Amino acid sequence: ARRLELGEALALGSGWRHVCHALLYAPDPGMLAGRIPLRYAILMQMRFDGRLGFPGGFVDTQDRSLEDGLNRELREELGEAAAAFRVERTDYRSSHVGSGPRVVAHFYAKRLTLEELLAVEAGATRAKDHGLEVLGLVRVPLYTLRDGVGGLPTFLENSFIGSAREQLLEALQDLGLL
Amino acid sequence: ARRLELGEALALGSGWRHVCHALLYAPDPGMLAGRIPLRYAILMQMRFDGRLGFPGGFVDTQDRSLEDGLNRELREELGEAAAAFRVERTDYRSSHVGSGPRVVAHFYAKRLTLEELLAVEAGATRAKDHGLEVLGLVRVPLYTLRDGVGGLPTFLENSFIGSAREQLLEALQDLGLLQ
Ligand code: NA
């Protein structure tokens, strides 16, 4: 893996492919078992290959920016509820270049209202990709249970796509969660 | 784990707790990328502990039977659309001594129409447990991708509760859901 400057990434040869994924989240006041604060509702997706990842996809020649790519792809995966907002350049977090495929993976985090995020959750089964490219959404448990293993640490033992695990860890550190 | 016949499992006494789970599935003629047959939609659930399991829960004092407990629990976990069908004794598959102090886990498999199963998925975010006890539904991918790893093999590498993994595989074999 290799962190790359955005300007650097945009200037990569025409050969390279770009993908954009977004962490959609909202403040959540709720309490699991009336005891353990949820803190935030964060969405991930089980992909057709059995790995957990974030919603998004490939930027294509038809797209004029990373962001039009992302939002276009977001609407496929999540359905019309995703068109209630737009992930923009101001939501951008990172670009990562692995080895293997010539792909740069850009990460975005978009804060929403709990209402908005819930509506995205509730409509995702009517999205184009549901039951095909996408197997279903999950929430990320931000809490660690009393045994120190259940909740977030066990969630992180699941199989993840690409940099999604790294991308999530980083975004939680930046939210003051650990 | 140690399989018990249903009559013996039921004969366990007083301090033993009973938990009931259902594999809900439906035929699906969909083709991934126009070429990989889905065969069936099968539901599992990301639990509050980050583990994948099947929907259901604990039978309580007020339930008349295992089946009443299971259907009640499914209504709580999945929401209203779970009440379009009823999981019966005919759907029962197995009982095992679970991981947990004195717990027997009963397992059921229930075939639905696709319409019924889509409706369980569509309503699931409004259920009582959603966002709390449960974190979200996912379909079990039954195919293996060209690389020989993506799909079912990789899915089987996720974190599972109790013996959910083993209940899935057995059910996949006995119900003839793979090729
Ligand atoms: Na419950």
Author numbering:
A (entry chain B): 4 to 181
B (entry chain A): 4 to 182
What's the paper's own text on this?
A similar cleavage reaction was observed in vitro with other enzymes from diverse organisms, including a snake venom phosphodiesterase (SVP), mammalian ectonucleotide pyrophosphatase/phosphodiesterase 1 (ENPP1), Escherichia coli RppH (EcRppH), and Homo sapiens NudT16 (HsNudT16). In addition, although NudT16 was initially characterized as a nucleolar U8 snoRNA decapping enzyme, it is involved in mRNA decapping and expresses across mouse tissues. Given the versatility in the recognition of substrates with diphosphate bonds, we and others have used some of these Nudix enzymes in vitro for processing ADP-ribosylation to a unique mass tag for site identification by tandem mass spectrometry (MS/MS). In this study, we sought to understand how HsNudT16 binds and hydrolyzes different forms of ADPr using X-ray crystallography.
F36A and F61S mutants were designed to enlarge the mouth of the enzyme with the aim of easing the recognition and processing of the ADPr conjugated to proteins. The crystal structures of mutants F36A and F61S show that the replacement of the phenyl side chain of these residues with a methyl or a hydroxymethyl group, respectively, opens up the mouth of the enzyme. The structural overlap of the HsNudT16-ADPr complex structure with the F36A structure shows that the binding pocket opens up close to the ribose by about 3 Å. The ~9 Å width of the cavity at the Phe36′ to Phe61 increases to 12.6 Å in the F36A mutant. Interestingly, mutation of residue F36A results in a displacement of retention volume from ~10.5 ml (HsNudT16, HsNudT16 H24W and HsNudT16 F61S), which correspond to a molecular weight of 40 kDa, to a retention volume of ~11.2 mL (HsNudT16 F36A and F36A F61S), which correspond to a molecular weight of 27 kDa. This change in retention volume suggests that the lack of phenylalanine at position 36 weakens the dimer, shifting the population to a monomer. In accordance to this shift, analysis of buried surface upon dimerization shows a reduction from about 1320 Å2 in HsNudT16 to about 1210 Å2 in HsNudT16 F36A, where residues 33–36, 50–56 and 120–162 are defined as part of the dimeric interface. Widening the mouth of HsNudT16 at the level of the non-adenosine ribose seems to be deleterious for ADPr hydrolysis activity since the F36A mutant is less active. Crystallization was successful for the H24W, F36A, and F61S mutants and the structures helped rationalized the effects of our single-point mutations. Despite co-crystallization efforts with ADPr, electron density for the substrate could not be seen in the binding site of these mutants.
